[PDB]
Design a protein around this motif. Sequence first.
Motif, PDB file in Angstrom:
ATOM      1  N   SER B  16     -12.382  44.927  42.218  1.00  0.00           N
ATOM      2  CA  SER B  16     -12.822  46.314  42.369  1.00  0.00           C
ATOM      3  C   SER B  16     -12.437  46.897  43.710  1.00  0.00           C
ATOM      4  CB  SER B  16     -14.327  46.449  42.138  1.00  0.00           C
ATOM      5  OG  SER B  16     -15.026  45.367  42.714  1.00  0.00           O
ATOM      6  N   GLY B  17     -11.599  46.188  44.450  1.00  0.00           N
ATOM      7  CA  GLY B  17     -11.016  46.751  45.663  1.00  0.00           C
ATOM      8  C   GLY B  17     -10.153  47.978  45.395  1.00  0.00           C
ATOM      9  N   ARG B  18      -9.431  47.984  44.275  1.00  0.00           N
ATOM     10  CA  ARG B  18      -8.559  49.104  43.979  1.00  0.00           C
ATOM     11  C   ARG B  18      -8.487  49.402  42.477  1.00  0.00           C
ATOM     12  NH1 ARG B  18      -2.670  46.987  43.209  1.00  0.00           N
ATOM     13  NH2 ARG B  18      -3.081  44.734  43.339  1.00  0.00           N
ATOM     14  N   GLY B  19      -7.805  50.498  42.127  1.00  0.00           N
ATOM     15  CA  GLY B  19      -7.558  50.877  40.733  1.00  0.00           C
ATOM     16  C   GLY B  19      -8.792  51.161  39.890  1.00  0.00           C
ATOM     17  N   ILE B  20      -8.743  50.752  38.630  1.00  0.00           N
ATOM     18  CA  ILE B  20      -9.824  50.984  37.685  1.00  0.00           C
ATOM     19  C   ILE B  20     -11.124  50.330  38.145  1.00  0.00           C
ATOM     20  CG2 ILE B  20     -10.633  50.389  35.361  1.00  0.00           C
ATOM     21  CD1 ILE B  20      -7.639  50.935  34.390  1.00  0.00           C
ATOM     22  N   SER B  42      -6.810  42.455  48.581  1.00  0.00           N
ATOM     23  CA  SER B  42      -7.122  43.789  49.131  1.00  0.00           C
ATOM     24  C   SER B  42      -8.401  43.935  50.000  1.00  0.00           C
ATOM     25  CB  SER B  42      -7.200  44.792  47.964  1.00  0.00           C
ATOM     26  OG  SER B  42      -5.961  44.921  47.298  1.00  0.00           O
ATOM     27  N   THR B  43      -8.476  43.236  51.126  1.00  0.00           N
ATOM     28  CA  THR B  43      -9.692  43.243  51.947  1.00  0.00           C
ATOM     29  C   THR B  43     -10.113  44.644  52.408  1.00  0.00           C
ATOM     30  OG1 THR B  43      -9.050  41.051  52.744  1.00  0.00           O
ATOM     31  CG2 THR B  43     -10.867  42.133  53.881  1.00  0.00           C
ATOM     32  N   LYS B  44      -9.183  45.350  53.058  1.00  0.00           N
ATOM     33  CA  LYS B  44      -9.464  46.646  53.682  1.00  0.00           C
ATOM     34  C   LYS B  44      -9.929  47.633  52.634  1.00  0.00           C
ATOM     35  CE  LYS B  44      -6.720  46.272  57.869  1.00  0.00           C
ATOM     36  NZ  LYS B  44      -6.328  47.056  59.090  1.00  0.00           N
ATOM     37  N   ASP B  45      -9.268  47.610  51.472  1.00  0.00           N
ATOM     38  CA  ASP B  45      -9.576  48.506  50.352  1.00  0.00           C
ATOM     39  C   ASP B  45     -10.944  48.220  49.741  1.00  0.00           C
ATOM     40  OD1 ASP B  45      -7.148  49.818  50.778  1.00  0.00           O
ATOM     41  OD2 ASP B  45      -6.303  49.354  48.794  1.00  0.00           O
ATOM     42  N   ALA B  46     -11.316  46.941  49.718  1.00  0.00           N
ATOM     43  CA  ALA B  46     -12.611  46.515  49.204  1.00  0.00           C
ATOM     44  C   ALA B  46     -13.726  46.965  50.137  1.00  0.00           C
ATOM     45  CB  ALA B  46     -12.646  45.000  48.985  1.00  0.00           C
ATOM     46  N   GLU B  47     -13.546  46.756  51.438  1.00  0.00           N
ATOM     47  CA  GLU B  47     -14.493  47.255  52.445  1.00  0.00           C
ATOM     48  C   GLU B  47     -14.715  48.775  52.353  1.00  0.00           C
ATOM     49  OE1 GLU B  47     -13.106  45.748  56.317  1.00  0.00           O
ATOM     50  OE2 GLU B  47     -13.508  43.663  55.760  1.00  0.00           O
ATOM     51  N   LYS B  48     -13.679  49.530  51.983  1.00  0.00           N
ATOM     52  CA  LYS B  48     -13.808  50.979  51.775  1.00  0.00           C
ATOM     53  C   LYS B  48     -14.656  51.331  50.554  1.00  0.00           C
ATOM     54  CE  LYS B  48      -9.634  52.490  54.125  1.00  0.00           C
ATOM     55  NZ  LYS B  48      -8.183  52.786  53.978  1.00  0.00           N
ATOM     56  N   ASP B  59     -26.439  50.078  47.954  1.00  0.00           N
ATOM     57  CA  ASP B  59     -25.975  48.948  48.764  1.00  0.00           C
ATOM     58  C   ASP B  59     -24.878  48.193  48.028  1.00  0.00           C
ATOM     59  OD1 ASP B  59     -25.818  47.334  51.062  1.00  0.00           O
ATOM     60  OD2 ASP B  59     -27.723  46.313  50.716  1.00  0.00           O
ATOM     61  N   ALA B  60     -23.980  47.576  48.795  1.00  0.00           N
ATOM     62  CA  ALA B  60     -22.846  46.841  48.245  1.00  0.00           C
ATOM     63  C   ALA B  60     -22.398  45.788  49.253  1.00  0.00           C
ATOM     64  CB  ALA B  60     -21.702  47.791  47.897  1.00  0.00           C
ATOM     65  N   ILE B  61     -21.636  44.801  48.778  1.00  0.00           N
ATOM     66  CA  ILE B  61     -21.026  43.755  49.615  1.00  0.00           C
ATOM     67  C   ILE B  61     -19.667  43.368  49.037  1.00  0.00           C
ATOM     68  CG2 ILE B  61     -22.129  41.691  48.484  1.00  0.00           C
ATOM     69  CD1 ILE B  61     -22.424  40.598  51.456  1.00  0.00           C
ATOM     70  N   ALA B  62     -18.711  43.060  49.910  1.00  0.00           N
ATOM     71  CA  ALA B  62     -17.390  42.615  49.454  1.00  0.00           C
ATOM     72  C   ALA B  62     -17.307  41.093  49.426  1.00  0.00           C
ATOM     73  CB  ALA B  62     -16.302  43.196  50.338  1.00  0.00           C
ATOM     74  N   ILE B  63     -16.867  40.512  48.308  1.00  0.00           N
ATOM     75  CA  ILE B  63     -16.626  39.060  48.281  1.00  0.00           C
ATOM     76  C   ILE B  63     -15.220  38.703  47.829  1.00  0.00           C
ATOM     77  CG2 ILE B  63     -17.317  36.767  47.462  1.00  0.00           C
ATOM     78  CD1 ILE B  63     -20.175  37.858  47.109  1.00  0.00           C
TER      79      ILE B  63
END
Lengths: 261, 260
Positions: B16-20, B42-48, B59-63
Motif C-alpha cells: 500500500s505504499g503506492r498505486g491501488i 517503496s519506503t518513502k512512499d509508504a511513510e507518506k 493512526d497508521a504504521i509502515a511495515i
Amino acid sequence: TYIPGRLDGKVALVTGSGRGIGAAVAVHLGRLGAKVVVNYANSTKDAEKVVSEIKALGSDAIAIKADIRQVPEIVKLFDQAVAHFGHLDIAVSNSGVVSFGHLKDVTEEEFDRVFSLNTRGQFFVAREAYRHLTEGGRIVLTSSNTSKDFSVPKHSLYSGSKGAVDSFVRIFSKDCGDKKITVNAVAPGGTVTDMFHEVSHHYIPNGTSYTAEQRQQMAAHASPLHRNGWPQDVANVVGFLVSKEGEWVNGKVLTLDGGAA
Amino acid sequence: YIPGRLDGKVALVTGSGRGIGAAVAVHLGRLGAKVVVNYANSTKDAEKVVSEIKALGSDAIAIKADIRQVPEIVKLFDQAVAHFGHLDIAVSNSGVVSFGHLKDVTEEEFDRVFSLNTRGQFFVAREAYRHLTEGGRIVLTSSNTSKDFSVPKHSLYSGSKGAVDSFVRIFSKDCGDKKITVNAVAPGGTVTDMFHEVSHHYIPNGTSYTAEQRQQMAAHASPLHRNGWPQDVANVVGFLVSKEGEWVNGKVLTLDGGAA
Ligand SMILES: NC(=O)c1ccc[n+]([C@@H]2O[C@H](COP(=O)([O-])OP(=O)(O)OC[C@H]3O[C@@H](n4cnc5c(N)ncnc54)[C@H](OP(=O)(O)O)[C@@H]3O)[C@@H](O)[C@H]2O)c1
Ligand SMILES: NC(=O)c1ccc[n+]([C@@H]2O[C@H](COP(=O)([O-])OP(=O)(O)OC[C@H]3O[C@@H](n4cnc5c(N)ncnc54)[C@H](OP(=O)(O)O)[C@@H]3O)[C@@H](O)[C@H]2O)c1
Ligand SMILES: O=c1c(O)c(-c2ccc(O)cc2)oc2cc(O)cc(O)c12
Ligand SMILES: O=c1c(O)c(-c2ccc(O)cc2)oc2cc(O)cc(O)c12
C-alpha cells in the motif's frame, strides 16, 4: 480412409496415463487410430499394461518415464515423443494430485506439492506441446468442477490450482492460434478412480461413517442421470476435442459432471 | 455509529505504499480505520501514505515485508496485532504483471509471478484468518483478465488471478467459522505505474501510440468514457469491508466501469 472423429495417422501424448482418467484417455486415442506416448512417473507396470492394451487394438505405443513437476523432463519427454514417432499432434495434460485442508492449516510444502504439478506442471506441458506440435494440433489440459461450478469446504488449495488452468487455456488459445493449435480443458466432476476413493469422504457431511461403496453411490446421485463419472466419460470428450471435428471448440473449459452443476 | 464507516476497526493492506494499495489504505483511513501499511521497497512512499492517514485524523504504521516469503507474512501479521491490539480487515493487494507468448515463458518468469500473485496472496489470507477478530473482512486482488477480458500473450498473469478467483469462493466457506467474509476485487485497466507498464500490450500496434493516447483509448473501454482510478477500487473495497457489505461473501467483483 478418413473416418469422422478418428485419429488415424496422428500421434498423441497423455501425461500420467499409466492409470486413472489418463489411462482411459490414452487407450481411447489408440482405439481412435492414434499412436500414443504413455507417460508415467511411478507406475511402470501399469504404463506397460496401457502400452500392451493399445498394441492389441491395432495401434502403437511407447512408455516414457517423466516427473511432470520437473520442467527439464517435460522438455525431454516431448523431445523423445517427436524422435520416436516422427511428429506429435496431440497433447493431453492429465497428471494431477488432490488436496484437502482448512485454509488455517495449509502449509507452504502442501501448497507447492499441489501447484507444482496441477498448475506449473500443466503450464509447461502446454509450453512444450506448443513448441513440438504439428500445425493444426490439439492441446487439452485438466481442470475440475471444483474450480468454478462446485464449492467444497476445506478444498481451497486444489480448487485454485485448477482455476488457474481455467484462465490458462482461454489465453493459450490466442497464442497457440499462430500454429493453428486449439487449446481447451476438461473439468470433470466425481469420476471413479483411485483419487475418487482416496477422498470421496471429504465431499460429504460425515463421510467417514459411510462405506466406500455408499459414498460412490451418493456421488452418483449428484448427476440427474444418477450415475458416476467414469474415466471413459472424460476420454469420450477429450476424443471429440482432439479430432478434426472439435476444432471450433477452442479456448474453453468443458465441465464433465453429467449435469450435476 | 455512521454507516459505511470503520471507526475503531484496524486494517492491513499489502503493498500500500503506492498505486491501488495506497488509495485503499488512505480510504480505509478516511473511513476511520487504523491502518498497517505494507511495502517491500517503496519506503518513502509508504511513510507518506502513513502521513496521509494521520492527516485525516486516524493512526497508521509502515511495515516492510516481502509478501513472497511466508515467514515474512507471518511476521507482518504478528507485528500488526502487537502494535494495534487486534486486526479486523486484511486487504491483499500486492501484485506484479507479466506478458509473453506461451512459447517464451520461462520457469523463472512463472515463479516470479505466482510466488506473489497466487502463493503470496494465498498465505496472506491464511495469516489473515489466523490473526483476525470475529466478523472480520478479507479482500484479495484479482484481474478483469482472469475471466472477463482475454488479452494475447497474457496467459501467465491471467492464470495467476484465476487461482485467486477460486480461492476466495472457497476461503469464504472455511473463514465463516469466525464470521469473516472473503471476496476479491478484479479491476480493469486502472491508472497506476502498472497501467503504464503494460498498456501497449492491450492495443494492436501499441508501441505506435504515445502513453497518453493509450490512456485515452483505455478510457473508451468503459461506456462511461473515463479511466479506472485507484479510488474506484478503494471505494468498493471500502464497502466490502464495512458492516453494510457483509452479505457480499465469496465473490469476485469486476471493476472495469462496465467494459466487460
Ligand atoms: N477423480 C476425480 O473425480 C477428478 C475430479 C476432478 C479433476 N480430476 C483430475 O483428472 C486428472 C486425473 O485424475 P485421476 O482421478 O485419474 O487421478 P489418479 O487416479 O490419482 O491418477 C493420478 C495420475 O497422475 C500421474 N502423476 C502423479 N504424479 C505425477 C507426476 N509427478 N508426473 C507425472 N505424472 C504424475 C499418476 O501417475 P503415477 O502413478 O506414475 O504417479 C497417475 O497416472 C487429475 O488432473 C485430476 O486433478 C479428477
Ligand atoms: N492497474 C491495473 O490496470 C490493474 C488491473 C488488474 C489488476 N490489478 C491488480 O491490482 C493490484 C494493485 O496493483 P497496481 O496497479 O497498484 O500496481 P503497481 O502500481 O505496480 O503497485 C504494485 C504494488 O505491489 C507491491 N509489491 C510488489 N512486490 C511486492 C513484494 N514482493 N512484497 C510486497 N509487496 C510487493 C508494491 O510495493 P513495493 O513497490 O514497495 O515493492 C506496490 O505497492 C495488483 O495485484 C494487480 O495485479 C491492477
Ligand atoms: O468424491 C467426490 C464426491 O463424493 C462428490 C460428491 C459426492 C456426493 C454428492 O452429493 C455430490 C458430490 O463429488 C466429487 C467431485 C469431484 O470433482 C471429485 C470427487 O472426488 C468427488
Ligand atoms: O492497460 C490496459 C489497457 O490499455 C486496457 C485497455 C482495454 C481496452 C482498450 O480498448 C484499450 C486498453 O485494459 C487493461 C486491463 C487491465 O486489467 C490492465 C491494463 O493495464 C489494461
